[PDB]
């Protein structure tokens, strides 16, 4: 076909980038993250007890209001860090920027209060492959490819810096108005996951880490750049940053003078300056500034691995190419 479909995103504090979908007849609207590190659609269920704080603060999907709903009822579980997210399968019609698709999705009935009660959005649309789909549920972008309608079997992300357009996802192409120059591509290690080879991470001009190669998951649903606990220790030693309980910090006045960090991917070094990875909430020496880089031990089969989240995606406009199993990067225009 010759169609593209774009969806406007909202940027909450540089950590959450979400957009609207509609599910059912008539449409029930939900704010969702479009997430390349997962393959399932999830929204909260009207069957979620009001003694879940994550449910109280969010919109709930009610099947008993949708005429196009089709029962399934198979139980689904995700074992997240803080606890289990579980629910059940349902099918309904889902709209995403003017494309309409009959989709199997999970209705959440329980989940931990953290971090989910802090989410400004209601759900998740996984943009990953059937290989990592819980219950092998056909993922949404698979069902869009099968309709024949997109101009190219690609989708792309634009994430803005905080302030205005917060971001944009385009289905079926890219939007030239939001990047400059041309894309540079890297082949997936294997289909199934949006993960590429990384050949080195540099602090300054010398290659600090990932000497004999490693893995980079390109995860639009991650807030930060993450590496293993042991790689992040070494990066933060090199940056002179201090370990807090859930983050790393530097004295705020040291912020602007921190080294460039570079990621070696395909045939380019992708560079972040301190302006790209420091949360400069002050310039004072009496205050501490958080870094947009965090340790996460990602469990097999996909990990151990780095994750390039929104920290990375903000600077580099990203295209996810299903046709050719590759990821393209271009420098974002802000
Ligand atoms: O941690 C994840 C990720 C993933 C994820 C996907 C689905 C789920 C299941 C349930 C989420 O549904 C939500 C929700 F995310 C938020 C609020 C809700 F009410 C619901 Cl039902 C949990 C985590 C998949 C993938 C690999 N791990 C890191 C990341 N990307 N999150 C949670 C998250 C990330 C960043 C900030 C916040 Cl506040 C949250 Cl809660 C979801 C947004 C993408
Ligand atoms: C739910 O859908 C799945 C497809 O993954 C199917 O295998 C299963 O039988 C369905 N449940 C029922 C019994 O309707």
UniProtKB/Swiss-Prot annotation:
Residue stretches making up the Peptidase A1 domain: 17-330
A GO MF label: signaling receptor binding
BP GO annotations: amyloid-beta metabolic process; angiotensin maturation; cell maturation; cellular response to xenobiotic stimulus; drinking behavior; hormone-mediated signaling pathway; juxtaglomerular apparatus development; kidney development
GO cellular component terms, semicolon-separated: apical part of cell; extracellular region; extracellular space; plasma membrane
Top EC class, one word: hydrolase
List of catalytic residues: 35, 219
Disulfide bond in keyword set: yes
Subcellular location: Secreted; Membrane
Disulfide feature: 48-55, 210-214, 252-289
EC number in record: 3.4.23.15
Function field: Renin is a highly specific endopeptidase, whose only known function is to generate angiotensin I from angiotensinogen in the plasma, initiating a cascade of reactions that produce an elevation of blood pressure and increased sodium retention by the kidney.
Homology family: Belongs to the peptidase A1 family.
Protein name (Swiss-Prot/TrEMBL): Renin
Provenance organism: Homo sapiens (Human)
High-level lineage: Eukaryota, Metazoa, Chordata, Craniata, Vertebrata
């Amino acid at each position: 076909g010759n169609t593209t479909s774009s969806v406007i995103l909202t940027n909450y504090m540089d950590t959450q980038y979400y957009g609207e979908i509609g599910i059912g007849t008539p449409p029930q609207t939900f704010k969702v993250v479009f997430d390349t590190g997962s393959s399932n659609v999830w929204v909260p269920s009207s069957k979620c007890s009001r003694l879940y704080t994550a449910c109280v603060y969010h919109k709930l999907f009610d099947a008993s209001d949708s005429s196009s709903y089709k029962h399934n009822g198979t139980e689904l579980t995700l074992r997240y860090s803080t606890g289990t997210v579980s629910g059940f399968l349902s099918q309904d019609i889902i709209t995403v920027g003017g494309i309409t698709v009959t989709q199997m999705f999970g209705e959440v009935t329980e989940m931990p209060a953290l971090p989910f009660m802090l989410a400004e959005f209601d759900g998740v649309v996984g943009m990953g492959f059937i290989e990592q789909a819980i219950g092998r549920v056909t993922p949404i972008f698979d069902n869009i490819i099968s309709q024949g309608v997109l101009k190219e079997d690609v989708f792309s992300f634009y994430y803005n810096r905080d302030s205005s357009l917060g971001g944009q996802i385009v289905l079926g192409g890219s939007d030239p108005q939001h990047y400059e120059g041309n894309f540079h591509y890297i082949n997936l290690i294997k289909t199934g996951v949006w993960q590429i080879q990384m050949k080195g991470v540099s602090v300054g001009s010398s290659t600090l880490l990932c000497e004999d190669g490693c893995l980079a998951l390109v995860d639009t649903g991650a807030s930060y750049i993450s590496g293993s606990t042991s790689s992040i220790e070494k990066l933060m030693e090199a940056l002179g940053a201090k370990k807090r309980l859930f983050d790393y910090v530097v004295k705020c006045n040291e912020g602007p003078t921190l080294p460039d960090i570079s990621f070696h991917l395909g045939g380019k070094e992708y560079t972040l300056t301190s302006a790209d990875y420091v949360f400069q909430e002050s310039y004072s020496s009496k205050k501490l500034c958080t870094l947009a880089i965090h340790a996460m031990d990602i469990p097999p089969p996909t990990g151990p691995t780095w994750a390039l989240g929104a920290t990375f995606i903000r600077k580099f406009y990203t295209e996810f190419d299903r046709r050719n199993n590759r990821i393209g990067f271009a420098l974002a225009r802000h």
